[model samples]
Target chain A: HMDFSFIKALQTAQQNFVVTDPSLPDNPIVYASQGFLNLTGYSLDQILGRNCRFLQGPETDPKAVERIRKAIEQGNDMSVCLLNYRVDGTTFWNQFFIAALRDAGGNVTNFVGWQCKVSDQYAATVTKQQEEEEEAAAND
Target chain B: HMDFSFIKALQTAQQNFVVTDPSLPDNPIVYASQGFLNLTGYSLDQILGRNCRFLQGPETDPKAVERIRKAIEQGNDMSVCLLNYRVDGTTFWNQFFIAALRDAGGNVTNFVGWQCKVSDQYAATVTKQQEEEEEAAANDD
Candidate 1:
């Protein structure tokens, strides 16, 4: 039997971790860690059968989604910062990474995703002020 | 005037970055990136002029703090896993790194920190459990 203890331990880590079965409809999530549940405020039952796209709310960028879609189609590893909404309707910037998990025969069996929220307060503050000042000081 | 375009671009990057003035009392944060604000749910007013320890709540490990403290005292760069709380009281596992930023005089001017949340889903699933089981199995020999 394969030593599966590592897989079990990963299930209980405090970092948001999830694995999806690409063979399933829309690549539904098959495994979700406790950290993922705590971060997203979603129950396993509510998330297990669904694709990650549910986190993309109305305010999510279409271009971000397109990028992810293209990466999935090509089975390429990718990382992106996306606007994601929690179960409470509040939004956070999700730093997302997706990697294809391959089996012994070099076939892709699953896709693993790691997600974390980004803090953008400092960037928005300085960038917004800089833009306003630049616009006002424009000579042309 | 010095160009600050690179600094501005770094602040706008999605990775959370922070710099603290070592010369200040308790090395308060002097600069933070937008990614830092988005993660902790704290405004700039609330986070600036404060030591990074404010993020360590009741549940945070004392050992982790002690490690960071010792490293700061020695001016050594270090990385640690810390339990950090948001302004909203939610907790997250912070994977944090601190590096000494030195000035032209070779004196430490600031400490730069790079912070990110761990995806335990990956750590626990692939690594930790394997180590634990391997340890136990080794003891049986």
Candidate 2:
């Protein structure tokens, strides 16, 4: 059997990641990375044991947010590219995803979310409102 | 509505973080803390834009090295305390960690390394304790 250090790694790592306790109420954040703190401009003290929805802003995609809500409701995974705002209200195109950790019995244990900022043009390409109806019709 | 001081903040920040661009060749260090250079007694000319493994010496623990390799391959995080050589060939107990940054496609795009130098007292105590634990575990086997 191989010994694992995933938990220890995340604890000391600087990657923009958050680990939430699924067993806890409202899936609060249990661990966070310094990279995440700097990326979102939030303090560990402020965000710890709190919901990550604080990263959302007025422009954040409701459809994608709804998708993640359902994904967590089922204790599963979610991946999407959407707009998100930092603590200071600066917006960025976010490549957001969450994965589930499980135990030997296949029971959900924790939910880990990872975030990255993509280029603004990347956001425009994904927004359907920017496209012409002819382009939509081309699919048919 | 935070001001655009983020870039300047990173440069002047005293934290010991080294940011490497995975998109660059050999995952070279793209940004380094002002404090990190001071702690290691290294100049920006020597460490910036270079791989951090230069800090490793012959005394560096092999097991810890291998573990970090595997951790980065899977784009996961890792933490360990190990021996690292400084610029002047001085060995110090390095409390080291790293995390992976991924792109929208889940491809690793960058790596951030955090380092801390443990005190001599702590290192001595933990090193001996680790040796005993290794021996005890071996005996259990």
Candidate 3:
């Protein structure tokens, strides 16, 4: 039998790990790793049984949200970069991945996700764009 | 009417990005960003048109490779952590994602990937596993 301890490895990993019940009406988070807690500045009590959409703020791109919704409905694997907010309303670019975990019978049981903050990259992109705009304006 | 310049935004982002030609044999890397060059310690001349498996070293997980293979063949999105070695042979856990970038007609055009090093978390997991192993050994003694 293959040692399934790697899945347990994710539970305590330093990278954010989240598990959600797809069977539930709203796909509430069933488990969240300490990394997730540290990243979002939210306690387990505050996050559990809640959909991750709470991370979305007004600036969240609708196209990204729609893609995630379609992936979940189709039970397919998905990766997206979303502008997400922490508890303090501080924004970060979340590089997120979600995939269905299957049971012994190959039925979809839960969706497991990995999240990482890529705000540095997002900020760099924004800075470059601003610089380019400024250069064009000066030339004009 | 869309701003295709968003595509250029990805090229300039600080995140490590790579674009591969899935239409070509071996899905050679057609483009790589400066961030990727800085991360892997490789020059663009060295990496362009090379399969990313060049990063895989002895400890790289076979299962992760297989999953990525399946995903690429099916033109699906996938995320995997691979133990990857830099040009100088320093190892880091590569947090990698690949997805089919589609044309406006919904045809798969190319595969774009984003990679970040998650060595801190990899080190934490390794330490925890060693602690668990030592505790189990003490219990048996």
Candidate 4:
């Protein structure tokens, strides 16, 4: 029945999601979907056995990292925003929804997540850069 | 036309992506994805302008972290397996794919990514534990 709860939760969530088993060595399990691939640009083979932080880079904030760790250690659900790195080394602002997977007894079993891109500010910055370059070109 | 060709190359080639603008103070500028949120256990309001690595913990593998860093420095696409921690202090293995995004002049401007979860090895392992626990309980009963 608890397994069915996870199954049903996945079905009800709006975004493409993934589940990871927390007890394994490095938690080597991941369940994903096509939308996740298109958004992150990673194929299933590359992502299946790897951690999700491949999206991070030097520009990422340190405080946010600490917060997530604290949450994980405490076994609670948390929501945070972070600038994630793309495969090409570009950065995108991503919103994260991280929660613990609990069993029927309320014991934590695993970690679950849903991520997506939504930031008019980041988009606006790109637009601003594009326009600035265009303006300089016009003057030239 | 030059920009189109360059973009095409970035799409086709294995290239390293990096940020050239170090002067800009980091800020939460976007909402990434539900997958990202769930892994970090952070809301859009909490992470929107923050850097992504805030998810890393002490247990995170530094070698893989360095490979990604070194690859970015070299401007070469880096493919490596990394150990990453989630917001819930859980660790998972993730695959990294880096490619260079270029400007019209063929110069690298940014990097793009495709991140994914590897397999269900952890699931299998945990299931094994549950099975073991069940057996123990049965014997005691």
Candidate 5:
């Protein structure tokens, strides 16, 4: 019997978050929140069972990719600024944060990723705007 | 470090449900599902931190409520036919189920309740028609 309290808390969150199962082949995504789907412009079907690297394009920096990979391999928390692509091939500077999620057995089960678009034209203060929107919805 | 997959699967369910924190005094509700809100004629603001017994009306069978309480006290899962009340004093036969949520230490942390309306007036079939959309047109003031 697993405690579902964490997932309920996640269900109530507003962050663009996802978790990938490192034990699975190619570190496939195990879960993608509604916020993550809205941010990436991809349906959940397109995101699940796929590697986050799929969001990388020809323009994606090789060093940034290595940085993320090395961080995961080393089992360290990572907060890196990297370029990522949407389904429409639109690129955005992503402020990506990922941390290892472990089980009570002290084994790394999944890596939880939090994504936010870096400040720029139109995307500036996007997360705060989302926070405000969520507050408004709750107040209703 | 609790495995949250159980909750992950539960979150996808469309059941009209709520989870109560028994670790707190008198088992206050900690979470409520959207389907529950639609069925009970109450908002999240009104439902949170309340006992499921709040739904028990004057006509509600005392033995059924007693059975549920005893089941919880013994840390056993109980499923019983219990009549429940809504905010507007409307009564519905609730197929009530209560179960214990335990941590790795085997301590009961929460109790989850699943509520379903029992079949009576529209007794056409029992298998598939059992699950369909129902709205409480309470005309709440």
Candidate 6:
């Protein structure tokens, strides 16, 4: 299997993620929270052996994929913002943080990431309008 | 009409939600951002004059909804890890924070929410496994 600390991180994140052992063909799996199920709509069984591409679609940016690929090739920490597809074909911006997980011997074994929402220009417009209205009211 | 601070919070959050005037319509409306479209796939037209429940589907956990409802009913901040369905019948976990908006006279007018994704288990597993091998290699030296 894998190291104990790795298992512990999966348990403690404010955002939840599952752990799997890729070494096992069916990779021994552990720790998927309700949050994980909510984000992907995939139950544990559906995801156990599959790669992450199941969540991605045609809309996913190739450049972002390349960057992540390059980072993985070099074995380093990488951060990038990209559109991630969901089960319903909708796209969401993923604030993806990836870092290589290593064993005590320093051989890489796992990867951990944290994903969340990003800023939007449309949101800015709305906020701007609201502020202007407030300013006008204050003058009145 | 409400406190300008409420508007400020909406502006500052990555997941933005704007409160609509209560007298404006029969439904509770919010001006959603690109973040909203990205999260739920509903266009502005489809979302206007509608409740946020438009985002809910069959798979949505009733328990989560109850938690939100209970909080709102108590006039407390509703912060829950909800299992909500998308427009397409798929579910996702969201750390949804809803705060009530008030009118100038102090009556609750609307509710605003900021949502973020907290976990992606599949990617997490890959991350976990990748970390292990890297650690093992370090110790050998």
TM-score for each of the candidates: 0.47, 0.48, 0.53, 0.41, 0.44, 0.41
Evaluation by TM-score, superior candidate among 2 and 5? 2
DockQ for each model = 0.03, 0.12, 0.08, 0.02, 0.05, 0.03
For model 4, how does the per-residue alpha-carbon lDDT over A54-136 read when each residue is reduced to its tens digit?
87889776766666677778876655556777666777766565667677686767776656565757545643554575589
Binned by DockQ into CAPRI classes (incorrect, acceptable, medium, high), candidate 3 is incorrect
True contacts kept of 4: 0.00
Tens-digit lDDT track of model 3 for B15-130: 58788886888889888888889988999899888898888889887867887798788877656666788899998877676666667686777877767677666755754564
List residue ranges in candidate 4 displaced over 4 A: A1-14, A120-140, B1-141
lDDT of model 3 at position A21: 90
Q: Which docking category, incorrect, acceptable, medium or high, applies to candidate 6?
A: incorrect
Chain B TM-score of candidate 5 stands at 0.79
lDDT of 2 by residue, B62-127 (tens): 877886788877877767778988788888887786767555576876777767677777667755
Docking class of 1: incorrect
After the best TM-score superposition of candidate 2, give how far the Cα of residue A129 lies from its true spot, in angstroms: 34
Q: Looking at candidate 5, what is the lDDT of residue A124?
A: 39
Query: Least accurate stretch of 10 residues (summed lDDT) in model 4 chain A?
Result: A1-10
Please list, in the order the candidates appear, how each scores on TM-score for chain B only.
Answer: 0.78, 0.77, 0.78, 0.57, 0.79, 0.68
Lowest lDDT block of 10, candidate 6 chain A: A1-10
User: Each candidate's fnat, in order?
Assistant: 0.00, 0.26, 0.00, 0.00, 0.03, 0.00
Best candidate according to lDDT? 3
Fnat for model 2?
Answer: 0.26
Q: lDDT by residue for model 6 over B4-36, one digit each (tens)?
A: 443433343344353554455553665776677
Better of 1 and 5 by lDDT: 1
Off by over 4 Å in 1: A1-13, A122-140, B1-132, B139-141
The 10 consecutive residues of candidate 1 chain B with the worst lDDT sum are B1-10
Over the stretch B53-120, how does candidate 5's per-residue lDDT look in tens digits? 88898977786688788888988765655567788888777766566767778898877776767664
Model 4 whole-model lDDT (C-alpha atoms): 0.54
For this target, which candidate reaches the highest TM-score against the unseen true structure?
3
lDDT of 1 by residue, A1-140 (tens): 00122233234334577888889889999988888898889999999889988898998878668867987788776665678888999888776766676665757788777676667764356435645664787855
Angstrom error of the Cα, residue A42, model 6: value is 37
Clashes of each: 14, 1, 0, 72, 0, 46
Model 5, residue pairs in steric clash: none
